């Protein structure tokens, strides 16, 4: 509350760390379905059912233009690109695995930098 703060975490670090992550998960071999936008025009269903697309591509051009306010807003998009994965794709299909693999190698990442 006012004038009584909580002692102050080091953030300084939060951009380059948060990049360097983005980086290691572009370049996995399952990143294939998730590095540019779905294209709307030509996958029926997506526009309609998902109602809040994200891909690397878009969260890496973010990150480089200041539109993450913090690291919380970060994890939000990537697992959003997970969450968007599930709701698109049967769990049995190279894309439904390879959206399981890269949600268990982001979320190891995360923790071993942050928690």
Known sequence: ????????????????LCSMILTEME????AWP???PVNLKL????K?????????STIREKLSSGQYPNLET???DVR?????????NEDDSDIGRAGHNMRKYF????????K
């Open 1 to 16: 509350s006012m004038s009584v703060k909580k002692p102050k975490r080091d953030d300084s670090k939060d951009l380059a």
């Open 27 to 30: 370049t996995h071999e399952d």
């Open 34 to 36: 998730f590095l540019l």
């Open 43 to 46: 996958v029926p269903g997506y």
């Open 107 to 114: 979320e190891k990442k995360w923790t071993d930098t942050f």
């Open 48 to 56: 309609k059912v998902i109602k809040k697309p994200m891909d690397f």
């Open 80 to 88: 959003l690109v997970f969450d968007n994965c599930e709701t698109f």
């Open 74 to 76: 970060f994890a939000l």
